[PDB]
Amino acid sequence: STGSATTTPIDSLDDAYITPVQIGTPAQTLNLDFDTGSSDLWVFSSETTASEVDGQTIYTPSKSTTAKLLSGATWSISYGDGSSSSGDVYTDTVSVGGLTVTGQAVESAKKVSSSFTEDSTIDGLLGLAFSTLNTVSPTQQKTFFDNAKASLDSPVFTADLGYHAPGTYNFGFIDTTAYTGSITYTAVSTKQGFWEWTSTGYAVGSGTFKSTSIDGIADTGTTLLYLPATVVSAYWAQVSGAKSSSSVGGYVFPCSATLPSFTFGVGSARIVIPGDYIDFGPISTGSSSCFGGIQSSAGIGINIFGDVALKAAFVVFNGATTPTLGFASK
Ligand SMILES: CC[C@H](C)CNC(=O)[C@H](CC(C)C)C[C@H](O)[C@H](CC1CCCCC1)NC(=O)[C@H](Cc1c[nH]c[nH+]1)NC(=O)C(Cc1cccc2ccccc12)Cc1cccc2ccccc12
């Protein structure tokens, strides 16, 4: 079996993407952030503290005839940005894009932190990293991807995210019309539970490619591209009005600059981010300074290939017994 679903950026900056998911019988459709950096599917629900819900769509397990309480299990998760949520667990039927799994754990939020309540467009998260990072206790639960692989035509999903435009998640097949030239695959380490891999180097604009290993994770759930401090300084040293601003938290530049491209290596292949993708947008509406899409990961302690890098590629998450990651230009 396969499935295919459109994913849309939540705002005109592409700060994140949502994809509809149908939970329950009869279906309730919730718009989830698919996050290849964590492994929990949780949603806002009829159990979540009322005062912690600003316009999101909730799941009500008591209206689903296939939901069942997973007795004794609870979960609690915090993310790299500080935000957090906990709750208890039902299993229910969940379909994306046509592809149905029965018996998928749907973590029901009793509490969510203030970042979640304040964003009305995301009704919860569907995790697609490996199932070792799931927070359910005492027995961890598998992601939707792992429960699906028995039935999928092939054990893969692709992410094809758009720049200020919608894109696709596909499960189970690779669409050969979505990309140009051929996919290059590079090895995944799962030792810390992420789609973690090693890029072979970088180049800024039309200058030289420097071969240097940058170990990073492919994370659909992080908006920006976070790289080591000295690669990031080498890129903004080509943009004449760019500086590091302590006030705003990163490199900012004049919104009028044409930014150069940034190339990253995948084995012997090279993926080119166009400089307009790196112009994140202005620091405030009207302002003449904009915030850059490439920042230093020194503060996070791992390099993150997030949606600024990923949406310049068609990306295959190969979840065979030895996983790999595949990238093609598009
Ligand atoms: C079991 C624990 C595991 C480790 C869970 N995984 C992680 O925490 C991962 C860390 C891993 C890369 C090491 C990160 C994970 O993918 C997680 C998924 C998010 C969670 C919040 C909701 C949206 C999805 N991503 C993140 O935690 C990254 C982390 C980060 C660190 N520094 C900068 N960013 N956060 C994000 O990228 C934010 C957006 C964001 C955060 C911080 C600075 C930003 C600067 C400019 C633009 C965006 C920034 C996610 C986000 C996007 C859009 C709307 C949002 C509304 C509310 C809350 C978050 C929103």
CB atoms within 10 A of CB 164: 13
Structural domain of 105: 5-174
CB atoms within 10 A of CB 198: 16
Experimental method: X-ray
Same domain assignment for residues 295 and 248? yes
Helices (H), the chain: 114-117, 144-148, 229-236, 275-278, 307-310
Please tell me whether residue 195 adopts helix, strand or coil conformation. coil
Same domain assignment for residues 135 and 17? yes
Q: Are 19 and 86 in contact (CB under 8 A)?
A: no
- How far is ligand 1, taken at its centre, from the CA of residue 94, in Å? 24
Contacts of 71 (CB under 8 A, 6+ apart): none
Output the six-digit token pair for 247: 């006030």
Domain boundary among 118, 153, 174: 174
Q: Rounded to an integer, what distance in angstroms lies between the CA atom of residue 302 and that of residue 235?
A: 19
Same domain assignment for residues 74 and 199? no
**Edge to edge, what strands does the sheet with 279-282 contain?**
243-245, 250-254, 289-292, 279-282
Same domain assignment for residues 266 and 149? no
Q: Rounded to an integer, what distance in angstroms lies between the CA atom of residue 102 and that of residue 59?
A: 16
Q: Are 171 and 4 in contact (CB under 8 A)?
A: yes
**CA dihedral sign of residues 19, 280, 185, 176:** positive
Considering the candidates 35, 88, 123, 279, report the single residue annotated as catalytic.
Answer: 35
Is the CB of 193 within 6 Å of ligand 1? Answer: no
Same domain assignment for residues 10 and 100? yes
Q: Are 42 and 107 in contact (CB under 8 A)?
A: yes
Same domain assignment for residues 214 and 291? yes
Residue whose Cα lies nearest atom 39 of ligand 1: it is 223
Please tell me whether residue 235 adopts helix, strand or coil conformation. helix
- How far is ligand 1, taken at its centre, from the CA of residue 103, in Å? 28
Q: Are 310 and 168 in contact (CB under 8 A)?
A: no
- How far is ligand 1, taken at its centre, from the CA of residue 283, in Å? 19
Same domain assignment for residues 214 and 316? yes
Under DSSP, the state recorded for 27 is T
**Edge to edge, what strands does the sheet with 196-204 contain?**
269-273, 262-266, 196-204, 210-218, 303-305, 225-227, 294-296
Q: Rounded to an integer, what distance in angstroms lies between the CA atom of residue 126 and that of residue 121?
A: 14
Same domain assignment for residues 147 and 188? no
Is the CB of 35 within 6 Å of ligand 1? Answer: yes
Count of structural domains, the chain = 2
Same domain assignment for residues 20 and 157? yes
Output the six-digit token pair for 172: 């189970």
Q: Rounded to an integer, what distance in angstroms lies between the CA atom of residue 123 and that of residue 21?
A: 10
Same domain assignment for residues 42 and 73? yes
Instruction: Report which residue type is found at 60.
Output: T
* One-character DSSP codes across 216-255: EEE-TT--SEEE-HHHHHHHHTTSTT-EEETTTTEEEEET
Domain boundary among 174, 206, 222: 174
Q: Among 42, 223, 302, 311, which residue has the most ligand 1 atoms within 8 Å of its CB, making it the best to mutate?
A: 223
CATH of the domain at 242: 2.40.70.10
Under DSSP, the state recorded for 45 is B
Under DSSP, the state recorded for 277 is H
Please tell me whether residue 118 adopts helix, strand or coil conformation. coil
Instruction: Report which residue type is found at 263.
Output: T
206 noted as active-site residue: no
Q: Are 59 and 23 in contact (CB under 8 A)?
A: yes
- How far is ligand 1, taken at its centre, from the CA of residue 178, in Å? 27
Q: Are 82 and 69 in contact (CB under 8 A)?
A: no
Same domain assignment for residues 73 and 134? yes
Same domain assignment for residues 187 and 308? yes
Is the CB of 17 within 6 Å of ligand 1? Answer: no
Domain boundary among 113, 140, 174: 174
Question: Whose CA is closest to 141, among 169, 173, 108?
Answer: 108
Resolution (A): 2.0
199 noted as active-site residue: yes
